[PDB]
Design a protein around this nucleic acid. Structure first.
Lengths: 119, 257, 69, 155
RNA sequence: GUGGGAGAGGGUGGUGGAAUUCCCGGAGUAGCGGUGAAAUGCGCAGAUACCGGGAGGAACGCCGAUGGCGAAGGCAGCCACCUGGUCCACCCGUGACGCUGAGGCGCGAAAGCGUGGGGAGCAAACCGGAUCCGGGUAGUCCACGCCCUAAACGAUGCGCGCUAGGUCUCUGGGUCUCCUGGGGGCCGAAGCUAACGCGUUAAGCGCGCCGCCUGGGGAGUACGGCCGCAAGGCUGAAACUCAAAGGAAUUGACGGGGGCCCGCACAAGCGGUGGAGCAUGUGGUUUAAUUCGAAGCAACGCGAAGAACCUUAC
RNA sequence: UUCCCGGGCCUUGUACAGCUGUACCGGAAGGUGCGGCUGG
């Protein structure tokens, strides 16, 4: 419906879930995907299989809008990063550049108890 | 073992008296208890542990077994069911610590016509010891468990009886339910709310506790200070100094203002 | 190879000579450890300060984005 | 084995053909240690092949052999009490093993009354590229290379 | 005194972005969020993933080290001002002006209190869920006053002199591959120690001064005094009870948790058992008796290598 | 040789993670927040 034909993809790969979102060069998203939309619930949402699926789900709803060329920017340190990468790489799309964009704090806010005890 | 003799001695159990046991377990307690009381009734919950209990108590006939918790049961129903001629009732529960704390209170606000309880607690939380106002042990819990009863620790116990080896020492506390409230109360709800408001921050001054913790408060700075003035309580005195009579008077003051 | 050897004579305290300073930066905007740079203790310490100065001025990146797998 | 490499036994090549593959085949046909019966079955089968199909059955046998020879296999792996059917390379020895094994079981699987005709039909069909053994090989191959995501488990 | 050096030493005044949260716009939307697993909770006034524009708070990612500074507690974004300690070279000046230190005075992590501000994140107590997770007040932050404790430890008081070396590292100076100062570690002469270990940074050989000990529990408790708004801190017993309470190191045991290697142990194969009928042994029943023993592997076609009479023990 | 079973040899903790100052516990055979130490 947009016919931008060339946008950027963002992958938030967390410990518990992986969400992929495609957007125009401007930055207005057109569609996403998530383990949740596939039908998986609970732990299995974090499992890379759901990544293997929402991977191409992005792509499909994107061929749906007639996009061809994609830029991939990944965030987080999820277990299913790399396999999701190879996935939206061979979902039938020409990937230009892939970059890791995991946001780290510059010793700012204090994390959870689970994420303390760092030496 | 054999601590049972001394606990029973401090229970002042008679033949005329009946006994309620909440955590009988293997019935060792009930065993030595049977030789002293005419009526012993035991609340029981563990479906697993019941069959082993049933056969072991066969020698003694004066026992009764009830298969629901103290929480979701009418104790007064049982008292009227079995204790028709009995003069007064004691309680000698020795159940795990994390369960005992609510049930003792629950038996108290309901104001059953029961006289007193002899129960095992941790040394540190012995109904917060003697609840003498100027102490660390003094608390909201103390205020609750002296508003309804007179408590004292008859003795303590190191070592072990049941568990292989614990880390902390234990004590035994003895109770008498009082006939009436300590001092006249305009509301139970307001009184208990005022208690929690005072004890919300122990270290902070009483005035700060009243102003902050109590709802509104900010708009009633002058009012609160004035009422505490007529109460003859100093603003900078802490909650841990005020006693039952004091809190009563303060509660009376705060209402109607 | 170490960065220090494969260079010419330069100044450390000069917080403006950008094209020498970048060669002390990784693909991401991070100061290299002593291993990679092959500098002595004092020169590394002063280099860190110079990096921070030039970096605050906006000549050097707070961070960069690694372009790889 | 924990120390050795379990040296491969060198089979004695067949008499008529002077070939080791034929010896291995007749050995695989064997049941209850009856060598003569298995050899007779094989010889009858190859004679049937010769009558039905013009060319020498030795070549057709060999061609079927490398026809029904796979390259990928899926093996189980036990990590955190889960199954990981990782694909893996097969050595020529292993290739030959499963090839002959599938050929023989498929031969026994046919509904024909006589064993010789069964094995002959299976051999000719496997040479062509149809039958139980062939379909099983593409079965295992398609089971393989379908879970390539598991390839990181080198094992 | 002159000439220089290094440094998260301290105080004051400011600004640099990464990140979290909230708000205002854009586009998009069926779920986000969480555990070993799950459940509370947020969302059609449209959440999370995304882009742009603002607000505010706290901390300073790589460098960062086994590194540095300080008397300790402790101290890391950057700049500027004020300021303490210290080191080296010159061997220029005073001529014992030194060491220690009962009391006093000052400093003193964190937690905690008072008079006011502030509050993003995290979080006692507390509110809920399955029986660790989601929220959440004080607090963590700033200014001024209190509090004065600790595994406040190198479990090692301070100053000076003497007593083999080797190696790594931080920072100075020279006649520069080495020589000579001041710090931080590691092996070790002699020596010391009950042992572990210490060993020019002594726990060695000595001198000077201060503090502290007199068996365990009771007990850092009771009374008294001093301090403090309070919690509490400093000083600090006795009655009574026990014959031990302890420190090192040796041998061994059980599972703590790892390393390694072997076995038809697993795997890779072939043929079996558990389904059927029959033979035999056994449990349990039954009987007058169904003689007796053998009980995970290591009892159960075992004693029994021959029960119609004998064997036979019922 | 990953795993199941059974052994042998060599390594570490208690018997013949812990501790600690403080501040709180109305689900206290102990729990948690702020630190600190190895006497792990």
């Amino acid at each position: 419906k947009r016919q931008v034909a060339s946008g950027r993809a963002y992958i938030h790969a967390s410990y518990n879930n992986t969400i992929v979102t495609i957007t125009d060069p401007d930055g207005n998203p057109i569609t996403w995907s998530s383990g949740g939309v596939i039908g998986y619930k609970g732990s299995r949402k974090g499992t890379p299989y759901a990544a293997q699926l929402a991977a191409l789900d992005a792509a499909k709803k994107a061929m749906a809008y007639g996009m061809q060329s994609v830029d991939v920017i990944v965030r987080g340190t999820g277990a299913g990063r790399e396999q999701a990468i190879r996935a939206l790489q061979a979902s039938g799309l020409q990937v230009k550049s892939i970059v890791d964009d995991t946001p780290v704090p510059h010793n700012g806010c204090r994390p959870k108890k689970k994420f303390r005890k760092a030496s | 073992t054999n601590i049972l003799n001394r606990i029973v001695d401090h229970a002042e159990v008679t033949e005329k008296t009946g006994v309620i046991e909440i955590g009988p377990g293997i019935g060792a307690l009930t065993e030595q208890l049977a030789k002293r009381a005419k009526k012993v009734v035991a609340f029981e919950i563990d479906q697993r542990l019941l069959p082993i209990l049933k056969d072991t108590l066969s020698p003694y006939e004066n026992v009764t077994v009830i298969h629901q918790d103290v929480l979701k049961a009418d104790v007064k129903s049982v008292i009227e069911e079995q204790f028709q001629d009995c003069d007064e009732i004691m309680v000698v529960a020795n159940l795990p610590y994390y369960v005992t704390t609510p049930i003792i209170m629950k038996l108290l606000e309901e104001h059953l016509p029961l006289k007193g309880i002899v129960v095992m607690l941790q040394k540190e939380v012995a109904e917060r010891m003697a609840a003498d106002p100027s102490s660390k042990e003094y608390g909201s819990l103390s205020i609750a468990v002296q508003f309804y009863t007179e408590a004292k620790t008859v003795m303590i116990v190191p070592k072990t009886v049941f568990v292989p080896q614990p880390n902390v020492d234990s004590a035994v506390i003895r109770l008498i339910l009082r006939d009436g409230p300590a001092v006249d109360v305009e509301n139970e709800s307001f009184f208990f709310q005022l208690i929690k408001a005072s004890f919300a921050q122990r270290r902070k001054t009483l005035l700060n506790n009243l102003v902050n913790n109590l709802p509104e408060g900010k708009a009633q700075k002058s009012t609160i200070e004035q009422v505490l003035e007529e109460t003859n309580i100093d603003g900078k005195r802490r909650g841990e100094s005020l006693s039952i009579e004091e809190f009563a008077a303060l509660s009376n003051g705060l209402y109607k203002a | 190879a170490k960065v220090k050897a494969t260079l010419g004579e330069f100044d450390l305290r000069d917080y403006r000579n950008v094209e020498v300073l970048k060669r002390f930066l990784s693909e991401t905007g991070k100061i290299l450890p002593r291993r990679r740079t092959g500098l002595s203790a004092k020169e590394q310490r002063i280099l860190a300060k110079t990096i921070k100065r030039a970096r605050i001025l906006g000549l050097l990146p707070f961070t960069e984005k690694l372009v790889r797998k | 084995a924990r120390r050795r490499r379990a040296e491969v036994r060198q089979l004695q090549p067949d008499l008529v053909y002077g070939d080791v593959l034929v010896t291995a085949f007749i050995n695989k046909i064997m049941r209850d240690g009856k060598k003569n019966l298995a050899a007779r079955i094989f010889y009858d089968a190859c004679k049937i092949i010769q009558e039905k199909t013009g060319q020498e059955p030795l070549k057709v046998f060999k061609q079927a052999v490398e026809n029904v020879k796979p390259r990928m296999e899926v093996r189980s792996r036990r990590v955190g009490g889960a199954n990981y059917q990782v694909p893996m390379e097969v050595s020529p020895r292993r290739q030959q093993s499963l090839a002959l094994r599938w050929l023989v079981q498929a031969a026994n699987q046919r509904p024909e009354r006589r064993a010789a005709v069964r094995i002959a039909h299976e051999l000719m069909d496997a040479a062509e590229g149809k039958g139980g053994a062939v379909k099983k090989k593409e079965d295992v191959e398609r089971m393989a290379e379908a879970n390539r995501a598991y390839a990181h488990y080198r094992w």
